[PDB]
Amino acid sequence: QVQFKLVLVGDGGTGKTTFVKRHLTGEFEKKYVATLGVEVHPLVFHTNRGPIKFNVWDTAGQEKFGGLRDGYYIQAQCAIIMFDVTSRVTYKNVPNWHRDLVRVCENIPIVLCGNKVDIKDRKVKAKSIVFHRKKNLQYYDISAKSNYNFEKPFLWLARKLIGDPNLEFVAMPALAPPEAQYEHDLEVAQTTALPDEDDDL
Amino acid sequence: GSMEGILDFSNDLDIALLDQVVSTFYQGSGVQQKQAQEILTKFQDNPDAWQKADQILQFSTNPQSKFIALSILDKLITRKWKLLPNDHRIGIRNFVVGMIISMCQDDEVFKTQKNLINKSDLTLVQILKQEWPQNWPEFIPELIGSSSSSVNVCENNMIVLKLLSEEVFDFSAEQMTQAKALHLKNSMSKEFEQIFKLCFQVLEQGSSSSLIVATLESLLRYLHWIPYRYIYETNILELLSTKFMTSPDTRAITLKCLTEVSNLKIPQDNDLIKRQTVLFFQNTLQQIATSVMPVTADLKATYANANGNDQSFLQDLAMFLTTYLARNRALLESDESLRELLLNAHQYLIQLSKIEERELFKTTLDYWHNLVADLFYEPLKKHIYEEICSQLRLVIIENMVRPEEVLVVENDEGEIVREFVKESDTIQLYKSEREVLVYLTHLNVIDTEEIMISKLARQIDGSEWSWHNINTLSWAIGSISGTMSEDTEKRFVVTVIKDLLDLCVKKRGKDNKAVVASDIMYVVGQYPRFLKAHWNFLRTVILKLFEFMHETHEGVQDMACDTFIKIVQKCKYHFVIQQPRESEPFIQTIIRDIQKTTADLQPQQVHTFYKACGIIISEERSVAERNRLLSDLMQLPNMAWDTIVEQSTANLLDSETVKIIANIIKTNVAVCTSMGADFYPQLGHIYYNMLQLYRAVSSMISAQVAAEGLIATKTPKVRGLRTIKKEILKLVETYISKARNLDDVVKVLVEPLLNAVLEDYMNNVPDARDAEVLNCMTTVVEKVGHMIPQGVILILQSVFECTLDMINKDFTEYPEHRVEFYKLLKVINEKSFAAFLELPPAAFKLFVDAICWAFKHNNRDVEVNGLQIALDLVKNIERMGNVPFANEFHKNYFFIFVSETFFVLTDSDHKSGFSKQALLLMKLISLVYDNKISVPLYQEAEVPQGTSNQVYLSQYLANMLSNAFPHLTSEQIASFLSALTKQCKDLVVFKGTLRDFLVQIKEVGGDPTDYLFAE
Amino acid sequence: MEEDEEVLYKVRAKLFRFDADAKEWKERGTGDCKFLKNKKTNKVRILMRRDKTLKICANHIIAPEYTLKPNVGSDRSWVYACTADIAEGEAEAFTFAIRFGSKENADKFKEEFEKAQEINKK
Ligand SMILES: Nc1nc2c(ncn2[C@@H]2O[C@H](COP(=O)(O)OP(=O)(O)NP(=O)(O)O)[C@@H](O)[C@H]2O)c(=O)[nH]1
Ligand SMILES: *[C@H](CC(=O)NN1CCCCC1)n1cnc(-c2cc(OCC#CC)cc(C(F)(F)F)c2)n1
Ligand SMILES: [Cl-]
């Protein structure tokens, strides 16, 4: 019922919007459509301490699409800093995003996420990722594509915000489900191939 | 909508309407919020928006409105400050300064509007970077003076000074020219002595705490660059290490300040600075023991509870102890009176290492590696840490993470199952735990064995029996392989196996038996040295793995296959020789049962098995015997292959036949991967028919696309047919990349291969072309390209133009073809550049277009190769000397490469390739300034006769930059090119001048003298 | 609300929904797909939750109307239309596709699916 504003920052192309979309709808977006300014998305989770609601401010990473930039960070109560383990430049910029972020939000829990660990030609080695130690950030290797650790950022932030180390995600109860010219709409569906037919699932 | 009213600037600005858009954006939701967002963006990005900044400030009540007003000033100050009249500059300075004072004097505002105040301070600091000190020499004295007035002003001045320090020393490299960064550093440096006095007086004459915290926060930044004397020649270390550690609201920042001090390489000679470095550490550890927790405290439990800032403080404590001790622990290791301090600090780290927090554990694990590595070499040191190292052995062993080889895990239901995905993010942690535990074992091998044996003993009798306890113990036992003596290893391994064997027999359950199975497999797989010396045991192990290949538990079955090949990679030799009391080499027993051994395995597991056999076979160096073994190993897939061929020669459509063919090829790939050059006899057995099959399936794919459309490529049938073509290509690529007899490759393989693949690739529709063809041709050109000059030409004709048309409409389609394409052009340009000299002028133009096309990718895989091709092409052309083709190339393409390299240097969208862009540009400029280009680069009319290409190059570039960046002055451009030209032999300075230019194009009024920084 | 139901069948799967406006399939969740039979109404439903978050990505009766069609690109998936799924609350209609790790899991899913339809016929 009570909600928390979360700001999501990082270089362009690191996967911020794809990460949020995976949590909203479960889809994986392959296209890169740069965010223009910011997009706000309600994101609820069901926990043993009741439901928790995140108002996710998914900001733009490209400079020329930045919009209000640090104006988006006002009143934020948590944040995720995103980079791309296949792009060293995005890690080198983490200190810049963190700087602009903590100048508005002096004492908020922040997660550092290295995305795209599913790609085997990794460039930002695990040993290199240390910026979070002195800055009291939590770090996770994640993959929005494989879902690797994709829940960890929100579970940790929910534990910090609610103030409960034993907070866990729980199963939302499932109520009893209820009890034309689709021939065309279904024909299109059958003849449109499913994506990633070589995945294990 | 009515919210768009603020976008019209003819009318005055209705501030009330502004606050509604702001509120609708920050506190709204849905479509209203989305509409207000787009409005505020348009308002903020209006070049005149700044003129209404003071207006918004004064008469607006919403602080978010004023924040966005300052964001408009910051943007103006950063990029267009020097484009303003001198009056608009002082005015802006005035109501920024006046605003800060106005907010700090209202105690209510100062308490509640910390966001707007900090933003205003940051805005002021942007003015300082522009105006200070040359046009504001009294800012610091006036700042110091005003601090003694209001306690709120003094505190806020610490914020301003903190931000100024950050912008000058911590974040200037990317945002300023070298010259301006140096100017501001020297300026702050020249005036710091006064800054320090104010900061030291505040700290000593304690005050509003929040002022003490602000002052310490500023000190943290100063410590990054200030001289050592300010630290050790004052009483400040005592203040930090005693006073400000007592109060918890100052303890966090104080500890971070002491961490920065700790990480200084101090003069190794001054005995007094060593005493001070010892003293502040002594004081700090004393304040923690008395004010926070004793060394015996359960930090694992404290962290888990997460009261207040306990987690942050425990992290900061870990950073302080590890930072200080890694640098200065030698200061504590001789003096007997300091022994207790040394051990108490390390005992805190022992307690910190028990916290359940991966990232924190890695931080402490890094220190432990630092320590045990020092104790492994440094004489007479390890005895000091004997008790510490014993506890650490226990911490590491009980916290071992699952190795990648262990494929079984417990799920949320309590069952042992196979792992969905790999645990990619624990691989590095395991390596680090192994490194430290291996060191700890070398330091006291007896203590490590006693721990592990007794821990094991309490698993048999069930004292501490659990899946977690047997797992971590097994993983630790396996991870220390190689540390003990052979004889100790024997007794040790023997003991471990016996009890793990007993433990299996002993335990009822599907799950217990799968856990103990994975653990036994990991341990035995980790001790090849032992297996080599005990043939009977090795045979037994292998036969047991064969039994596990029949188990219905997927995890155990898959792990048996990986353990098998893991053992083989290390013990292969003991499978090719005939061991004592054996009728034949064990490889013959494996081969003769391969069908029933692998009967229940999945196809890719069967292939792994064949690859393992291939490893063994390659140990036999008698050609007759190796070829015979190879022939035996391949007997099953060759019999199925021969059967398939007879049928194929009667017009494959069967989905089950396609799967069979694919697995035959995949088996040949698996064996070829491990046998390399030795695989040639098996390859020649199938080669000719294999390529005929490649042609046959190609016709099927084409016929399917024709009858069903492009969608056919998605069907399981067509995908199955293309798998065949891909595995065929992979098999040929695999062999050719390892072949040692290149004459046979050329005279036997290459000719039929090109005839089979090239025309098929060229004459298929784009969606039917396999990027694997490009990958195969790359290997062919890499290995024998120098022997088939006409073959390379044929490859270009077949794949160059049609592939380019696939990938030159955007940067996203056909990503594999994109990458493999430029890997192919790269190797051709390296090994067989003559093929490009034969290209008609039109096709050589596309080749240049293709290279520049690669520049503009953000994909590193394409970009790096694009810049490398351009570099190598320039070398290739330069080698040719003063001949017509080299002359024509420069006349046609020199300036195309200069301007294109410049475009990607300056567009801010290809930051990743700056280094190679710079290198490429440096080579092109140096060609002219070494008169390596023999003909003039200009036209008959453009320039007087006899004008050096140096002159024309500067004129061309000056004009290019003038039109591409019209906001630069002619002097900026002239100074830049003059500097850039003088430095075209010194890459480091060359790159500095380019970075200075990238800074200046982001603003107006850049100082042209900044380009003299090197001179 | 699952204690008053029996699990007749369970299999890991990936579920898709068809976006007609974009003419593309979009993942909706990956996890355990279950056939649950209510012990009070004897009605069988599909209930599928995402891994880790345990959010419902499918909740609807295995109606007798439905028919499992194949997808042109897969031999281990089924396509069918659904008129009342309450995974996201408001009973919406969807065209669903579900893919499995193997073709035996797809064929076995089809067998169990049609059985459940018979039970719902009563
Ligand atoms: N292989 C892989 N690709 C990913 C992953 N996450 C995102 N991507 C891909 O990276 C590209 C960029 O995705 P996007 O979400 O738009 O990144 P962004 O940070 O929102 N960009 P911007 O800041 O400009 O809005 C997309 O093509 C996306 O499919 C991932 O985890 N793995
Ligand atoms: C215990 C595990 C066991 O037998 N489990 N079964 C099969 C796997 C699924 C669950 C039920 N166990 C008994 N023996 C072994 C074992 C024995 C080896 O022999 C060495 C000897 C002698 C004399 C070797 C192995 C291994 F090397 F393959 F791991 C395992 N495990
Ligand atoms: Cl980033």
Ligand SMILES: [Cl-]
């Ligand atoms: Cl010693």
Ligand SMILES: [Cl-]
């Ligand atoms: Cl060997």
Ligand SMILES: [Mg+2]
């Ligand atoms: Mg985005």
